[PDB]
């Protein structure tokens, strides 16, 4: 973040979508929730129909309980690409945000079926399975999550 502040010009910083994504993910990692949202909104302003890595935003907006923006983003993402796994995991995150979670598990497993090498879908599945007061399924899901991404 200090390197952004010093070694990155402001005009490049507030214009590059990739720098915005990296900066938002970084501020997520420091658990700076307010900072990340007002730049991810700028990212959506730059291009609404971009998927890349929307898992971070889905995780953020689940915490902030913004049901309407999440609904809009999920609708737009599906209308753009149905086969990208991040879109399906965002939908499952919204569904878990609402209330029902069995269909969220099913959506997550389908998203993992679209691309077996997506570790964040596995780890989101495992984190969700804790809410199902079930541990063995959660434990197996966590193990298969860590299998996909060694450093997670």
With CB under 8 A as the contact rule, which of the stretches 5-13, 14-22, 39-47, 89-97 interacts with another protein? 89-97
Structural Rg of the chain based on CA atoms: 16
Q: What are phi and psi for residue 110, nearest 5 degrees? A: -65, -40
Neighbours of 17 (CB within 10 A): 13
Q: Which of 54, 107, 121, 138 binds another protein (CB under 8 A)?
A: 107
57 binding another protein? (CB under 8 A): no
101 binding another protein? (CB under 8 A): no
Give the Cα-Cα-Cα angle 88, 94, 98 (nearest 5 degrees).
Answer: 145
110 binding another protein? (CB under 8 A): yes
Neighbours of 38 (CB within 10 A): 9
Q: Tell me how far, at minimum, the Cβ of 143 lies from another protein, in Å.
A: 5
Contact 78, 51 (CB under 8 A): no
Q: Tell me how far, at minimum, the Cβ of 31 lies from another protein, in Å.
A: 8
* Binding residues for another protein (CB under 8 A): 31, 59, 62-63, 71, 74-75, 78, 82, 88, 91, 93-95, 103, 106-107, 110, 124, 127, 140, 143-144, 146-148, 150
């Amino acid at each position: 973040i200090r390197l952004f502040e010093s070694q990155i010009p402001s005009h490049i910083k507030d214009t590059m979508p990739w720098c915005l994504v990296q900066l938002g993910k970084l501020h997520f990692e420091i658990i700076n929730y307010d900072m990340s949202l007002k730049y991810f909104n700028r990212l959506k302003d730059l291009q609404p129909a971009r998927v890349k890595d929307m898992e971070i935003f889905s995780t953020l907006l689940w915490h902030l309980h913004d049901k309407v923006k999440s609904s809009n983003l999920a609708n737009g993402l599906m209308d753009t690409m149905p086969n990208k796994p991040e879109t399906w995991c965002c939908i499952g995150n919204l569904l878990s945000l609402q209330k029902d979670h069995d269909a969220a598990i099913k959506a997550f497993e389908k998203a993992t079926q679209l691309d077996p090498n997506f570790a964040y879908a596995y780890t989101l599945q495992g984190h969700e399975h804790s809410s199902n007061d079930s541990s063995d399924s959660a434990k197996t899901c966590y193990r298969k999550a860590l299998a996909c991404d060694p450093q997670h």
